[PDB]
Design a protein around this ligand. Structure first.
Ligand SMILES: CS(=O)(=O)Nc1ccc(C(=O)NCc2ccc(Cl)cc2Cl)cc1
Ligand SMILES: CS(=O)(=O)Nc1ccc(C(=O)NCc2ccc(Cl)cc2Cl)cc1
Ligand SMILES: CCCCCCCCCCCCCCCC
Ligand SMILES: CCCCCCCCCCCCCCCC
Ligand SMILES: CCCCCCCCCCCC
Ligand SMILES: CCCCCCCCCCCC
Ligand SMILES: CCCCCCCCCC
Ligand SMILES: CCCCCCCC
Ligand SMILES: CCCCCCCC
Ligand SMILES: CCCCCCCC
Ligand SMILES: CCCCCCCC
Ligand SMILES: CCCCC
Ligand SMILES: CCCCC
Ligand SMILES: CCCCC
Ligand SMILES: [K+]
Ligand SMILES: [K+]
Ligand SMILES: [K+]
Ligand SMILES: [K+]
Ligand SMILES: [K+]
Lengths: 281, 276
């Protein structure tokens, strides 16, 4: 009965699909609740700034002012500092910043502050990604293993001394607390602190940046290394290492969260099974 | 000997690490080769536009121009972006981890929710994309039963015909999830042929720079378009997940082969040099 299990499978995929549809709608409405207000205040007050300089200089043709801004915003995506007081500039595609970019491709973070303009750069980026991504995978997989076997020796010692007057599958609960507790210190708390100090971001922004980057979402609204500050270059390498090990960590963490849902889902599926079966007496 | 296998493992991780380091350096140098030129041409010609705009409108003094650009850079950090739909789109960029980021949260609350929404969303989406995988896999599973019947009752038989199947997967696959959608994008968005395919690959690999985004400009869109892209993403992401996984396995193989080919090169360099 091969098609008997296939009918069961399509029934599962579909309910999850609808759960995910529903999840997007909830999310959609909570984001627009949160962001539509500040957007409206900032759009009224940017038209306030506009009319102050629109009529304060009528001798500018005035259909060309919105065309000027289009030439600035188009050119900001390639990354420019168009000013008289700072017309000498650093490079976006120097030795290092192209090494950084290559990293955003293979990890699939893809911040995208810097991205290829040349038709060749795009064609190479496509080739570089398709071979790079799988390749990086194996490293991040091995970075997983090692870091796993490190914490494997770390729980042998702590599941020896906590052998008091002891269940097997309940000491699993105490281990996974030590994974999340120490884990959020090493790959989230401590690095966010460093970022707060070095970059000059808010406490929230750092942790946000940590999570957005290590989940490989990589908006790129904040980027470590991104501004022209000073930089120790003890710094930037330490971040490469952080990324290597942080991405490993979040891969597990997300995988745990995944399994918790599996469980929560059985429970809630059989709780509805109960709710129907009693349905008022 | 438990530490005997651990030393083997760290030896594996390291060579891969150095391969990946080396891969970034090659890549680094090919990107800078490619992009440092266009950067220099665009920086000269943006200072040409700057000094041209003082002269072509002398009404503007040099001191108000630097104040204007500060109000544009201020306004670049904001930009409706968060309408009914575009917040649904955003939520999608979070869970798929494409994360284009054309639209991103500014409010301290939006960031805090985004963190919570991502950590529970990402794993959840995974299961769907996993199931979308299965089904699409079992569809093409019936599709190869029929085509491995009519071609396996005659010419050159087994162990080479696996090579012909995986060509049919990639050939048809690149039509449905790369060629055909890029065409539609060329027509609808008005991108170049290259840009479409670039956008397809950048998005379906979940890299998601966001230098191009389907739906992103303020054009008349047909109500039918944007949903059809949601579906494409759902099934395209599934496809590329396998494709990347294949590419991964090819490397596994290429790596054994190249490891034993060096094993050969050494072994003759040996018993050609013992020959005195
Ligand atoms: C805007 S810029 O391109 O001109 N400036 C730079 C920006 C960032 C970096 C860099 O390497 N940061 C650490 C890092 C490393 C690897 C990965 Cl995947 C992610 C991260 Cl955050 C370097 C230069
Ligand atoms: C400045 S804007 O944000 O308002 N413009 C938009 C940009 C995109 C969309 C949209 O729905 N695109 C289809 C789509 C769906 C889900 C995912 Cl993950 C990716 C994609 Cl490309 C809508 C508006
Ligand atoms: C296991 C219970 C569910 C929630 C556990 C949350 C702990 C991890 C959060 C990491 C954020 C750092 C705290 C903020 C310090 C300024
Ligand atoms: C100084 C400002 C610090 C702000 C700390 C707020 C961070 C809270 C993050 C929420 C943790 C989510 C855990 C549950 C996910 C399953
Ligand atoms: C010891 C591991 C060797 C693996 C090297 C694989 C190199 C892949 C190059 C891809 C050619 C386009
Ligand atoms: C990008 C690198 C292309 C392949 C380079 C060859 C790998 C050398 C290490 C193999 C030793 C077994
Ligand atoms: C600009 C400094 C970056 C040096 C990189 C060193 C570690 C790379 C590991 C992939
Ligand atoms: C976060 C809301 C999910 C609701 C799911 C309902 C499935 C029976
Ligand atoms: C002192 C050890 C450093 C911890 C690794 C993460 C650093 C950003
Ligand atoms: C070299 C033995 C394997 C463990 C090494 C960890 C080094 C950070
Ligand atoms: C099999 C083709 C479906 C996706 C094409 C439309 C996406 C732009
Ligand atoms: C047109 C340049 C091609 C780079 C591989
Ligand atoms: C919020 C989840 C509801 C599942 C029945
Ligand atoms: C707007 C969501 C529809 C997905 C097919
Ligand atoms: K921008
Ligand atoms: K991204
Ligand atoms: K991005
Ligand atoms: K990603
Ligand atoms: K991404």
């Amino acid at each position: 009965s091969d098609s008997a299990i296939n009918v069961m499978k399509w029934k599962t995929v579909s309910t999850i699909f609808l759960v995910v549809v529903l999840y997007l709608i909830i999310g959609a409405t909570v984001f627009k609740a949160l962001e539509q207000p500040q957007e409206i205040s900032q759009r009224t007050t940017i038209v306030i700034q506009r009319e102050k300089f629109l009529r304060a200089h009528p001798c500018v043709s005035d259909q060309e002012l919105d065309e000027l801004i289009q030439q600035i915003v188009a050119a900001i995506n390639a990354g420019i500092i168009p000013l008289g007081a700072s017309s000498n500039q650093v490079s976006h595609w120097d030795l290092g910043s192209s090494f950084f970019f290559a990293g955003t491709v293979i990890t699939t973070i893809g911040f995208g502050n810097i991205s290829p303009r040349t038709e060749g750069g795009k064609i190479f980026c496509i080739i570089y990604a398709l071979l790079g991504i799988p390749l990086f995978g194996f490293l991040l997989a091995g970075v997983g293993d090692q870091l796993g076997t490190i914490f494997g020796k770390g729980i042998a010692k702590v599941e020896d001394t906590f052998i008091k007057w002891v269940s097997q599958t309940k000491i699993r609960i105490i281990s996974t607390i030590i994974f999340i507790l120490f884990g959020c210190v090493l790959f989230v708390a401590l690095p966010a602190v460093i970022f707060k100090h070095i970059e000059g971001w808010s406490a929230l922004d750092a942790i946000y940046f940590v999570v957005i980057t290590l989940t490989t979402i990589g908006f790129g609204d904040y980027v470590a290394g991104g501004s022209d500050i000073e930089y120790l270059d003890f710094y930037k390498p330490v971040v490469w290492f952080w990324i290597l090990v942080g991405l490993a960590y979040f891969a597990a963490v997300l995988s745990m969260i995944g399994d918790w849902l599996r469980v929560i889902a059985k429970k809630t599926k059989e709780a509805v099974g109960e709710f129907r079966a009693h349905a008022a007496e």
